[PDB]
């Protein structure tokens, strides 16, 4: 509970002129490694630690960027993991752990989770080592699943989510409601539901148009 | 010698006004009225303000980009230069969104979305079009750097239009009035290669003088050649971080070339798959429920033949773009088309259609003043 | 304006009678001075305004009032036009 | 006034730049004082019979539903307008 421990002190920090200054670095890089650990976030905390890298290329630590890159990509499909490749260095991105990290980050945003869960070295522990992290990019496959499709086979959600077995697809089918349909296909979403198209000849604007014609 | 006789005599103008506009805009209130009262024109104290956003911003661009090592210019800046003015106890009147302005153009030279949002809070005092269309200028910027390209495509239309119901004569926008044109023309030149079946919306935006080139880009770009990806990309980098001065090009210093690897590599990025997501929609869905007949006719179109296939499909439909069903029975698949519409330009148009008749009405009757 | 604005009025002293005309069943007996006349004044009423009620009505109502609305934005143009060339023989 | 110039002569009356969007005084505003016989002659055409007023009130009407009034209007715009916009 070091990330509650950490909040205000590290808000007023943030705010101040204490993020163009490289020596907060201290609380800052021991607060990053705090959401990566305890399962929580902070974008500003690892953004102002991603800019002071940027500003000093020396002071960069490459398990801290990781437990920047990793959580940022829990969090999609937000801009968060493109600010993390805006202040990373060219001779940056380059480095290890880092440069397995962003080439897994590339499969995410493509939506390429099949391949996602054959490109993942099982040897490196510091991927282990991110509690939640491997619920996390599942939980973020399910939840695009839903704004995309309306059926899916057994089978196929399976192996999505890193080949799941029968009782392990149990959790991620109980997660949004989801159920089985006759001897057949998950139902993720309904038709009508899922696509909620724009449409001609709105006109509402005489409530409006109207009045400003009035005189 | 004379490139840094200007240069330094710039930077030390302006931490000398620095400490006298702490000093005025917290306390002096007496000053501040004694500032009020004797000319004709409080103009001349409110452009020092943004005068200063843009020239300093300069100053500081080339000393960014001549010291790479060992870096005095960041620090010094973003701990005093920016903070101290804006953070602070503001101006009694509208001078205190001129700092604003300042620092936000400041604040988007760091590749952020973050405070746009803490610094629209604080932008309690009226919108004024002079603070409206550069706010809407960096706030579109921000909607484009957070891949929310429905949203900021609306937004650089109207800054672009320019029936903006102001006059803006007397200096107020000066040196730098067609790159208000041209980068509200470029930066809006992305958006549409990405989600180009919405906007009916688009005639308004941009003149035909420009939209009959930048149409055939975006064509050109995605069907059948990777050469727009240049040439676009070229015209895109100067406007989308706005780096006001290249330093003099020259082999015998470097310096120069070192922070602009980053600064280009960082919007290398954004464009490449970006642009990628665009081909796959290029295509458009002409039968909206695919039989075997269509979605086979479309496996075709998503990539080569081969011992692997649908998987690929599978992958494409879960961008922005695309929402369906698989029926595994059927073996079908049903999908989302989706459109805007046509006739909401004429509404929008009826009032400033009118300016143009009270602009009309209205300076005619300024000149009926003088010849009378 | 004043046409309009006696024309609900119309229709609400019409909503006031109307009640008169129902009320005198509700209560206990009377209604002798409406029932098939009142009836056929009011069918009649609806067969004129309005018309009778598909939905293809309503969208060639709309498509009407989208036409009135593009000649009276016409007339707008035409008074901004007729201002510009006036405007530009003053100077 | 006397009569304008078929000549240059007009260019010092010009000079003048008097008014051609001048004021139009409003015509109605309170009661004439002669409103009272004709006050007297509503209750007579109102209160004790339907054959006086609804032959004023018809009118409205087929002010709509009859021939092409909005449409003639604009045409004859179509026709009176173009010609003096094209003569300017």
């Known amino acids: 509970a070091m990330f509650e421990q950490m909040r205000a002190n590290v808000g007023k920090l943030l705010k101040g002129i204490d993020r163009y200054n490289p020596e907060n670095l201290a609380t800052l890089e021991r607060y990053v490694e705090t959401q990566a650990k305890e399962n929580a976030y902070d974008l500003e905390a690892n953004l102002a630690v991603l800019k002071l890298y940027q500003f000093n290329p020396a002071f960069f630590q490459t398990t801290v960027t ?67 992290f491997e619920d996390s990019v599942r939980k973020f496959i399910c939840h695009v699943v839903g704004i995309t499709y309306q059926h899916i086979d057994r089978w196929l959600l399976a192996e999505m989510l890193g080949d799941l077995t029968d009782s392990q697809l149990k959790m991620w089918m109980s997660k949004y409601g989801w159920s089985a ?30 009045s400003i014609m009035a005189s | 010698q004379w490139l840094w006789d200007i240069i330094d005599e710039f930077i030390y103008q302006f931490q000398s006004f ?9 306390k002096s209130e007496e000053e501040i009225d004694f500032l009020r009262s004797n000319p004709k024109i409080w103009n001349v104290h409110s452009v020092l303000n943004v005068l200063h956003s843009l020239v300093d911003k300069s100053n500081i661009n080339r000393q960014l980009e001549v010291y790479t090592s060992g870096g005095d210019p960041e620090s010094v800046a973003g701990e005093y230069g920016r903070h101290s003015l804006y ?79 102001t ?117 458009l869905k002409l039968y909206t429920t695919m039989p075997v007949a269509k979605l086979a006719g479309f496996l075709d179109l998503t990539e080569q033949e081969f011992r692997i296939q649908l998987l690929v499909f599978k992958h494409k439909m879960k961008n922005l773009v695309w929402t369906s069903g698989i029926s595994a029975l059927d073996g079908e698949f049903q999908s989302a088309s989706e459109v805007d519409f046509y006739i909401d330009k004429d509404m929008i148009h009826i009032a400033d259609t009118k300016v143009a008749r009270r602009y009309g009405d209205f300076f005619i009757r300024q000149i009926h003043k003088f010849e009378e | 304006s004043d046409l309009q604005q006696v024309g609900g009025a119309s229709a609400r002293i019409q909503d006031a009678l109307s009640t008169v005309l129902q009320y005198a069943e509700d209560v206990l007996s009377g209604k002798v001075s409406a029932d098939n006349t009142v009836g056929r004044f009011l069918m009649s009423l609806v067969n004129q305004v309005p018309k009778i009620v598909p939905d293809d009505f309503e969208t060639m109502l709309n498509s009407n009032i989208n036409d009135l609305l593009m000649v009276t934005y016409l007339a707008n143009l ?13 100077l | 006034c006397k009569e304008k110039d078929f000549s240059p002569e007009a260019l010092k009356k010009a000079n003048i730049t008097f008014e051609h969007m001048f004021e139009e005084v409003p015509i109605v505003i309170k009661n004439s004082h002669l409103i009272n016989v004709l006050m007297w002659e509503l209750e007579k055409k109102s209160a004790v019979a339907d054959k006086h007023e609804l032959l004023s009130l018809a009118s409205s009407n087929h002010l709509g539903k009859n021939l092409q009034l909005l449409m003639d209007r604009v045409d004859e715009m179509s026709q009176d307008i173009v010609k003096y916009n094209t003569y300017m």
């Open chain 2, 87 to 165: 953070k602070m106890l503001g101006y009694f009147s509208l001078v205190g969104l001129l700092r604003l302005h300042s620092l936000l153009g400041d604040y988007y030279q760091a590749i952020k979305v973050l405070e746009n949002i803490e610094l629209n809070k604080k932008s309690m005092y009226s919108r004024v079009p002079e603070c409206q269309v550069t706010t809407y200028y960096y706030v579109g910027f921000a909607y484009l750097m957070m891949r929310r390209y429905q949203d900021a495509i609306r937004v650089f239309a109207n800054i672009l239009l320019y029936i903006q119901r």
């Open chain 2, 18 to 26: 620095s400490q006298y506009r702490c000093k005025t805009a917290k």
């Open chain 1, 66 to 132: 990781a437990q920047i890159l990793l959580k940022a990509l829990t969090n999609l499909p937000h801009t968060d993991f493109t600010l993390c490749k805006c202040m990373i260095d060219q001779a940056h991105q380059e480095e290890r752990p880092i440069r397995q990290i962003l080439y897994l980050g590339d499969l995410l945003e493509t939506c390429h989770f099949q391949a996602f869960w054959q490109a993942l070295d099982e040897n490196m522990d510091l991927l282990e080592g991110i509690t939640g």
């Open chain 2, 167 to 283: 006059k803006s004569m007397f200096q107020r926008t000066t040196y730098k009035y067609e790159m208000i044109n041209k980068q509200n023309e470029q930066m809006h030149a992305l958006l549409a290669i990405a989600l180009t079946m919405y906007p009916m919306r688009i005639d308004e935006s941009i003149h035909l003088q420009l939209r009959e080139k930048y149409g055939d880009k975006m064509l050109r770009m995605q069907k059948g050649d990777p050469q727009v990806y240049e040439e676009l990309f070229s015209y895109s980098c100067p406007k989308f971080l706005s780096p006001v001065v290249p330093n003099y090009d020259s082999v015998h210093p470097n310096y120069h070339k070192e922070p602009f690897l980053q600064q280009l590599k960082v919007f290398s990025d954004e464009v490449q798959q970006q642009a990628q997501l665009s081909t796959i929609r290029s295509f």
């Open chain 1, 181 to 210: 349909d006759e001897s057949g296909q998950i139902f993720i979403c309904s038709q009508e539901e899922s696509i909620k198209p724009k449409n001609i000849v709105e006109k509402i604007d005489f409530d409006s148009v109207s």
């Open chain 3, 78 to 90: 035409t008074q901004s036009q007729i201002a510009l060339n006036e405007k530009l023989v003053n």
